[PDB]
Subunit: 444 residues, 4 copies
Amino acid sequence: MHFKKDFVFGTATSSYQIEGAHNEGGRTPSIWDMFCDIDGRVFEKHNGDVACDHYHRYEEDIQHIKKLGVDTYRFSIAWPRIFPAKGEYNPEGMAFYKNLALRLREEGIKPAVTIYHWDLPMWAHEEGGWVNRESVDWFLDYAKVCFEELDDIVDSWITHNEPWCAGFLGYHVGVHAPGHRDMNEAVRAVHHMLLSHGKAVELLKREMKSTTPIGITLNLSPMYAKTDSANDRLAMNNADGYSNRWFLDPVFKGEYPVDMMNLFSKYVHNFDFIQSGDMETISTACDFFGINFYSRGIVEFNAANDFLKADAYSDYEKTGMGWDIAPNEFKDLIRRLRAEYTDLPIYITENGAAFDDVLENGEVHDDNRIDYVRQHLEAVSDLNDEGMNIQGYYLWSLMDNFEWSFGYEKRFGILYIDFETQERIWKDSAKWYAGVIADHKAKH
Amino acid sequence: MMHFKKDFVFGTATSSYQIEGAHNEGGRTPSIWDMFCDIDGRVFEKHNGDVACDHYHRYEEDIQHIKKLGVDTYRFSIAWPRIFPAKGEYNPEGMAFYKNLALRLREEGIKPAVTIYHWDLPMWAHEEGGWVNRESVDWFLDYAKVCFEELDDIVDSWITHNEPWCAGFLGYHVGVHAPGHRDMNEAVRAVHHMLLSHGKAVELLKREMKSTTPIGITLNLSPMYAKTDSANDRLAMNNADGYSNRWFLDPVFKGEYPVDMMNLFSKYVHNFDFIQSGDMETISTACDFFGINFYSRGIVEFNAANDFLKADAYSDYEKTGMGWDIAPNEFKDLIRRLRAEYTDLPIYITENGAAFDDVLENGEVHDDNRIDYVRQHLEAVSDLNDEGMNIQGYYLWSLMDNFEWSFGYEKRFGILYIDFETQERIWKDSAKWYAGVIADHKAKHA
Amino acid sequence: MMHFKKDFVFGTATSSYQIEGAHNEGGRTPSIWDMFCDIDGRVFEKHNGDVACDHYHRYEEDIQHIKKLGVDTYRFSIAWPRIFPAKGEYNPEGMAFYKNLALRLREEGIKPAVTIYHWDLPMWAHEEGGWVNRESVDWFLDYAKVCFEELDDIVDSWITHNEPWCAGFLGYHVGVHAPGHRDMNEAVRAVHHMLLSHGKAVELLKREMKSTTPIGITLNLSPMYAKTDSANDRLAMNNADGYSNRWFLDPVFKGEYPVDMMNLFSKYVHNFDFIQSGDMETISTACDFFGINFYSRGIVEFNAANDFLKADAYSDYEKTGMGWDIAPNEFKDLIRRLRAEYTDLPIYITENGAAFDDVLENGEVHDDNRIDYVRQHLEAVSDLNDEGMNIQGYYLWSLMDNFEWSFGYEKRFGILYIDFETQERIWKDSAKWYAGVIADHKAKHA
Amino acid sequence: MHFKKDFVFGTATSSYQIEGAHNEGGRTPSIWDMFCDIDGRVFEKHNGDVACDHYHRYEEDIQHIKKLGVDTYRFSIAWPRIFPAKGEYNPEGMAFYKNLALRLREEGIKPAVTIYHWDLPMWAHEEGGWVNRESVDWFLDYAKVCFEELDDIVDSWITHNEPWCAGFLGYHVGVHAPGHRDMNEAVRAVHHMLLSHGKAVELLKREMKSTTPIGITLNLSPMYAKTDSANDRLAMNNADGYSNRWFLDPVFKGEYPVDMMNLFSKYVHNFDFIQSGDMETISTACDFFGINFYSRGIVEFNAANDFLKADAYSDYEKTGMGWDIAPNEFKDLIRRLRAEYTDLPIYITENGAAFDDVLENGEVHDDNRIDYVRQHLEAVSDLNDEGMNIQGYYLWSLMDNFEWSFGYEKRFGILYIDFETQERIWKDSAKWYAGVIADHKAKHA
């Protein structure tokens, strides 16, 4: 439990989930705005018009952050505010983020900035979106202005959050925005996201001559086989390939996994979207590696499935989301990354869980939630003792927010939010986390 | 508004594993569904049909309930593992129960409609490969013969198979029902043998046994509709229609499999040698009636990421507690289509009904929502017979709240509420209504 | 024994790139085939249409040969890169050649039948995507528009496309023809845009321009037969028939694609959004005739390892030098089928002929083998017209020995032998005989 | 042209290609008999009824082998001679082989024996052939009787020859016997061939405690991309996996390549034929590794192929078969096997070429065939200098023979054969190969 003095505690949010003010400050609609209006996609047509109203109440949320004592606050910049039209910079929107990052340092908080957290402007989407290769140049223009204006203030940069979500989860299964269901589109989308990542890192480090730490965050879910039979092992491999290896291998090994390419060849009949001079750029050296972790997945074989797999039954204890609680399996995942992929310092940029919390006499007794977080904080200590060099942990999420396709029915926040009144109320969960940070900063 | 002719049959329906229980007595061995209920993650909270509605012991009581409805027909199924608990070994104690039942129904002036196969395949047959094995055709005729020999005099009508789409594709391809396999190659062979076993049994009964007792198959049919007028959605609907409907309708009425589905299934099914010479002519053997299980429609749209190029589409319709669309208009389209494209045989609706979140209050469940549902479809039936569509009967699914398969006891389709802890039956709202509907219909006639 | 009706047209046929030569003369720019010849392994020993039959210069010479055959009609194609060597840049020099050609034939008493597209797509269109691109519809109308304005008065009949299966599937799927791509997704759009451009070109001439010149399309057709009577081989035939024939026949006459083929192609093609609203109605626009190119049948069997489930089966038929089956009985089968299911338009056999190992000896060529082939088919045509199949005409492929695409100059289809060194035209026995067949028919007339 | 002092030169044949005597000595028909009779499968319905008539002329061919001075002669055993019926051993059949092995030893020639060379008996095929898992147990019954009676005489054992041909080429493409076209049957056949290999090896090394060298021979063809684009490399990977890694990985790594499994999943929708313990048995340690090498294949990408390849155009000098002459790429392949796969001793169990041989005055002067073999032997010589440890080399083929689907139209032999006289005539190349052996032995002191 003895975290090193340089160890960083944090909390995290994303712009569309909390900001609101959807038509104010020059903001134009995003892909998610249009997704919310597509039928059958989101719980009861819920949207991010208002959300946590963070764009107006940003100063107030900073106050909450100071008392927790977190070293770092991770937030995302809303693209359709910065470029509501192509090539058209909106200074009111950037102004909001510049003061905010400056203000966090004044209150002694390191700002960690996510460039892309899924909020693609509608103008980009209508030209094909990420499926179009031009999407690469549009993102660097977006990233450049942010670098120009904020690099002196900001502590760390994150290019993309969960390309698996924005790519496959978004363009193949059609659950997230823009809700397309086309595997050919999906692999072109992912590649251009990853390629846009590498060009921006390249741009910042060489041209812009900046030494601000930059890297990517990938969400990783380890996959396990039900039996030792050959069938169940193939399912694991493909599940691991689909969620994890398709992204890790190009980032660290500068190649795509041929086993997944052959499986995807049932839908993807050309890889000419891979131009000469891409995978080396994609695999450009970063200063750190970012990991979003939430759970594992147990898989078994399916003969009727195109990818030969379906989800199997878990008897493990499960959260309100139905996700497995898996701190042991979390420990398994990191050793693999050091052993096979990378020795860079890792930052856990998101972790948390949803349960059905009931407010009783002004307080929420979420002891179930406490257990989940503590078990992972215990794992982080054990792993730094193992030499896994985990220099930080960001708790997802700071506030209860718009939880994508589940809407406001699921609460990941450490701060409860009455979405009717926009009132901020500190949960019982802070009691330990607020105190752990104080306690850690006491031993020195 | 909804009148019917003098020979019109009102009915209600059940299946064997869903209500009987007593899985140990009278020589019964386990079926595929017993083991399936014990497999983790497949059925709601590991629920099973060990006790069920305990209908095996209180069948005489349930007979009185049928009598009081005044219904002309009762449709039930025969449990195979009670009749052949091991390969080749007949158990006359199990048969006597069904012999007594048919006789008791005859004494009370009620027509027994009997389903031979309602998805409860004995384990010994499964362990030899089940419906996947071509010998299965022969097992079922041995099973059917014994039933014919003892019950053909008493019984008014025979049903060979109930919803082979369910017993086949959702069970062998999608893995939701027993035995819970997921293999399209396995799925089409299973279906083929089921349809072939139906036809061989029908051929054996009318030719060799020379019996005139009405016999037929029961298919569930769900008409499919496009979200948009685009070409894509037309492809999607066609394929959805082929998967659920055309794959089963074409062999029964055209003596051929639809080549468009064969081509789509060739992604998983790389040989059709299971279709032997002579088979397709047997499947299309002339029947006395056609049976339809109807519940709802399905709206579908195109999917590039889907192997069959289709996914379920959002419906703005009023929905049941199951989430199923209420679709009496679309029902009429299906029936009109069948006459136009497939058959002019007399149709019987062997299952129709709905599940809603029933609450017990002062010994009563005020399921006006279910009354409305049932009423609209019975109204639709009357309208179609005015068009000459010749729907000669209707069986209401279901008589009792029961084990609803993978949903367990969590979903209630019954007109009777059942406290499974106490086995109490309680008559409510409808059924009196259904009894009143038949009474009102009876009272116009002299 | 033949006997043809008095209004019956006899003809012979060519295509522009196969005979014209003059590849760099008259403002002509390279075509896809020009580019296609210089890729390795695609065409026999790198042969090209640079010189070819040099017909651009000697066209005056060749008109007399055509006149001597006594043919009613001469079919030729127009080279697109001669008419539009650059986008929107009309070349009056290139066109001037073809009006003169057509004018001279009218003076010699010969009907000019003109094919707009015979596979020679200009390179500028290909570099922008070619037929895969929807703009190709628009490019063709500009090309088609200039030709309708200047020639519609002289010409007797118009053929929009020759063998879109070759230009489409052989070119974009199998990679054998120009531009040699191997992509089924690209392939279905290319065919679709070819078929759509046809419908627009027909719509343009008769609606806007109000003209009554007979117009239609030419499809190559090959009837398909199952090796065995098994279910598998029936599927194999269905799928072979669809790839070659129904995919083209159904849109032209039914205004729809065969869903069974769409499902088989869904292993490579995962969206049909290229089919816009209105497209299918344009494709099925009423024509004056239907053209058929016939060469052979194809015997197929089932293959589990084949994506389209078929391979070629061993044939005991008499054979040409190329290995294509000689199938006059099967030719009659195709025509009867067309009248029953598809169309009652007047049919024209726009190409028929054969290739054999022709040697020139002592100034004359005794090609009785080629005669036999043609003889068997001409009797059949007369027989079909007795049955009422209303075949108003026949074109004999070809006139001269020419560039046979990927096979080059190794294969001779001509009734006139060509020494490619001197470019001398020498009449084969078959040309005199065919001329004599017409003469005898004409002498029978009045 | 340097060789180790213990290096073995040799030649090789197979039973159905040379033996003949198709209805003599108790032999029953093989799958290859029926395949030859199916229309359009083999050149002009040719078959192995007479072939080189080696069953009768075994004494003459033994002399020819002794004169070449080859250290080793490799031949295959005809299964339908040994088990003409199910469960019924035929000692008359074994006698033919017993004299041959005994006569070779007398002449100082080491016999290297291939157990399975594609001539599966008809009783087995009609029960499913290699598609049935039982086929594993039949081959062990076949192998056991061979070990008890011949393991004392024989110098080396080869369990299976080219499971790619017998498996994929036979059950997937349809070019070889039994000429089926079903990938599911094919992958089941391959696994059972490989499993039967390993179970037979285990019996020899554990129960019979015998140290006679045993191993498998795979044919390997290295794969090269036409261009350096990403597309053409994926095409290459899949060709490499289909021809090579599908066989090398289970034998040496004890696993199937998941990349190939996914690609084959378009046809193969269950892998329950891989029982537990199977892959463990297959990778049981062998004494050597056999390689049949003939050529490379240059491939490029094609979007309309299921396996993403249709082969690319080659500008290399080519044989009469149309196969590339590729000794440089051969040196790459061996290096690859040492880096990734095995340090076992390597034997080149088949190498050779077909050229349009013209008989002129009791002579067919095949200098072109001499070039081919000499180039490869130099490459063999160059590799041993690197330490690649190639202990031996068998020249294909001893005589002109039945070349399967090509029939008697093609000639791989160093000895020409007039099929109407059945005369064996040596070429200068035969003399040359003999003189190479002579020149090797000659430099000792």
